[PDB]
């Protein structure tokens, strides 16, 4: 069923929109074939410059809302593999290089609505071991029994607002843990979508 | 009992080492992620919460000497670092003194907690153009001030010494956790780390067989 | 009034409670907060479940070693994997999160349980047979000798994920995992699965004496 | 009264010198069976149970010195040694310090209950092959820990140091009881014997009448 | 009559076996000649690769149990001398060599169901006189008045729970004190022969 | 507040009261059970009773030395043995128990009984006299003068273990053995039997000031 | 030693003088 984040409900103690807001949204489907690597979104940089949500985080400078996530997957009786959901707050991606002090930069670091490509998996490109990595909320996805994946987050920050371009406050992650494998005379991309809701936004500022 | 996270915070161990010449001063920034056995273990949690405390030690080299009155001061964050041993940054009324002779049982002094948010943060994913007060991760919500130990004389002290800085932490509370490190990072404020030569966790054996 | 002055008048004792004077005296902390999430102690740390790596072959290389790899081509009777039971020594339990926080806390006790899922397709059907031994022999020969210990027997087909308790580890105790039949698919679905391993602690796991770990650096 | 199990223990005595030269370091193990005046009244029981308290006590030769920084570590079971004068052993923090210049008065330490075990026991009959963590008597639920002088200076301190500890026993509950010894044994860790000249109890006399 | 030993009842606070292990064992007859020295036997050792005992003692690996003793020595009215039998907690025996270090090695330290011979009486072959050997629970064998002793011992340990293989709990000893005399014209062997019963064994572990 | 200094500032007493800081603060021991035989004060090791030696002889070597020959052969009237009862001071009290916990203890007064018990044949039947002079004289020197005293006539038929309460020792006194009866024995029979000694202190038995004792190595 | 671990019954002279034993069911061996 769903799991929540740490177990808290998201609630809120400026501005409050209602319902219009309250509407899915939906990325877009990525392709997951037989050698991918893993993905990754930085969210609440990804609801930027689309929609009612991008007009009210674009000109408001102060922000607090927490998400409702429903991962999805499609596939027949005939694959086999298993994903990984998790929602790690604090995502914080360091660069490859050893010296000087070669860093990531811009474009890797804030990917958009476009979401991102793990370069080494094995140490979530962080320094941060995989097999540790179930501290953090998780949920299976596993194709020969569920596919479906409901995670709730609430608003996890030590100030009580802040700036929704600069700030990032977690990230998703999804990793192929077992690659995948089918006999031919099939498909060969199971796609993979999304579904983002936001529930208690309560924006503050003016332009 | 003794694995509350109080008790698995609350030994004080060595941060730096902090030697003078005669110059006629040594200066130092706080920072507790100095040695690697610290920055491992508080790296565990995200947002954390203490009152430190600290204690310096002074051993002339042949060790132990005749009296001197050496002061410690401290400077709190958003205030300007004293520059030579007799400007006039050492008779401002913020900066708190402390004077300790050689001779005398080392002294000991409290830090309180010094953040505008509620919470350290060790770990910031953004850019501080309009933030608080390249730059990816770096945040002026974590320095806490300076020591600038200094000798008390005229002129002509040419005393050679070297001091030390013992850290207990007290009152610890923690927030939501983070798997431990695995890969010897190589900077100081960064997570990176070789990528060209990836670190095992377990070390080999023969076959999968053969427990 | 008259004080005299016992052994232990200047010294500095490294395990100290006794406060010095505040530096800043009327200074007012920021109130704190309700941020969620909040750990009391780090025991609730290490109940909260980890992957396990077995295959730590020197061919296994990459993510392909949290991985016990089965085979259709296997036939009765042979081992599928086999790893000690022994958190904080160097072997299989070091990636995994009990095992290193026994690297610190000398001495410990307790009940750790060991949980395996499979990763195969919905066709696919089997048996395995999960067995343990006691710490006071080596790990079985034969397939009669792992059936007269504490045996689980395991299915693909009912359920997908099974469960066991080890009682009573302290400061070995071998777990293999037998294959009772041969793989069984239907035409055009691939042979080769996969099971990973998990691993925890229990509630009655306990620990004693502090002590640093062996990293590899030093700064 | 005075009789009692209590008083019996509570003096303190000498139990080692633990001397250094300048390797610049002097370590030695935990051992009550020292001499002979307290291994012979701590064999009357088997089981005991007790916390002890130390006392270290500093002489230069000659008598009296200048002060110096020297420091006293202590090592729980089950941790490494230190090795050289200077390693990074001597930085941990599960390793508690003390630092006592020359010239201040004693320093005193006590240590707690530290075995698995729910007792001591001097006497052990069986191998620890598959025991707790030739090998004929000896457990390793018996080593209490190290404590490595060492004085802090850079270089050159050419000191030629000696120290002393003394060693109380309290709260101690005794068990089952067990003959004292009365044949002077030769080895430290074994009951031998020298059976080729076993001596007697009591002095002899002319005859058996005439008392 | 029946003597314990520092007075406390044999009972149990894992399985725990029955009237099948209720039976007596019966050791090996021992002969007590004119110029005998002493036996000595360190149980739970004896009882291994014997009987129903034995099987719930070498694959098990954790053992409790209080022990039952009755040592009976059989001679008519014509015989003389006195006995000596004692239950000695922790019995650890030394080498009676000088000087390197020559331990006893095995065979001696752990004799199993033929008990073995001390080779100084005197000392006890442990460094400690004969004279002070009544502190521990002792009876008295006198051959002109009483020919049996009941000891009944409980479990002495520390740890509650030990293996039965290495450790060893205690030992039993004979010891003549007074050495045998008799005028000629009969028998020579005055048997010694010993009743062992388990009370309450709990045996845990498996193989 | 203020205080000032005593005679009495920087000194190391050796017999203390005063505790240090501990080096493990929050430590747990480990909790005890219940060990039989627990002792309490070392006055109940010094009641229970040991083998005193008494044939101390040069001739006699090993183990029959802990032995009063008594022989047939002897005739009415002859001493069999005799020894001071004084425990601690060099002679035949030394190998028993409260002989040696009165080497530490200067200062000592109570009340020590001596217990004997025979060894010989079902027929034989004789009797012994049993004496004690009170310290201000030696021993006696005929039969007449013993029976003077205090004394308790002991067979071998009847009883087969007599007692005997010696009043107040404090920091000599002599025990002799008349022998009041040549020992009868039927044929067949060997006529050399062997009368133990025993020793031990009762209730109303003291101690004073602590001294280490004197043993003969030192490491 | 395999003989004890049957069924036995210590018999003296000196106490008793006469001691019996119970063979259960017999049928149409057994060997004491």
Redesign the interface.
Known sequence: NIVLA?GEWPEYCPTRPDVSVNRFYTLDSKMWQENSTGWYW?FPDVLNKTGVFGQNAQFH?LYRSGFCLHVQCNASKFHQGALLVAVI???????????E?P??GFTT?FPGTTGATF??P??LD????L???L?YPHQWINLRTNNCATVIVPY?N??PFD?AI???NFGLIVIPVSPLKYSSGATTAIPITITIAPLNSEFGGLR | ?????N??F?????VGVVNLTDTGYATWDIDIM?????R?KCEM???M?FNA?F?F?T?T????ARPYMLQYM?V?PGAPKPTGRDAFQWQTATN?SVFVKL?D??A??????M?????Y?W?????????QH?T??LCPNNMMGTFAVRVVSREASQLKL?TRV?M?LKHV???????????????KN???????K?T???????????? | IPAELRPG????L???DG??????PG?T?????H?????????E?CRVETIL??????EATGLTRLL??VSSQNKADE?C????VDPGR???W??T?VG?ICRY?TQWSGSLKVTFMFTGSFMATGKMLVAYSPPGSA?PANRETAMLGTHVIWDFGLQSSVSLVIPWISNAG?V?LWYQTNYVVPPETPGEAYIIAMGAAQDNFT?KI?K?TD?????
């Open positions: 740490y930085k400078y707050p604090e995502f914080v991606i360091a660069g490859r290089g050893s010296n002090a860093h990531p670091t370069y080494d094995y140490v962080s320094g941060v071991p097999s540790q990595a501290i996890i030590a100030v700036s600069n700030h990032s | 009992l003794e694995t509350t996270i008790h698995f609350s030994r004080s161990g060595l100095g040695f690697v056995q610290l491992r949690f995200t947002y919460r405390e204690t030690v051993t080299e042949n060790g132990g401290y709190p708190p001779t049982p080392p000991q002094v409290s830090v309180p907690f953040s505008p948010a509620s919470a943060q770990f910031y994913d953004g850019y501080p153009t309009f933030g390249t990816y991760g070297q013992y207990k509370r923690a927030w939501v956790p983070r798997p431990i490190r695995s890969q010897p990072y190589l900077l960064f997570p990176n780390y070789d990528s060209s990836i095992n966790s377990a070390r080999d054996r023969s076959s999968i067989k053969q427990a | 008048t200047n010294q500095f490294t395990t100290d406060t010095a004077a505040p530096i800043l200074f902390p920021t109130p704190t907060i941020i969620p999430g909040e750990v009391h102690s780090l025991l740390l790596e077995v295959n730590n072959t020197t016990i790899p081992l994997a086999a790893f000690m160097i072997g299989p070091q990636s999160l290193q806390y790990q071998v293999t620990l502090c640093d990293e590899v650096t030093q700064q």
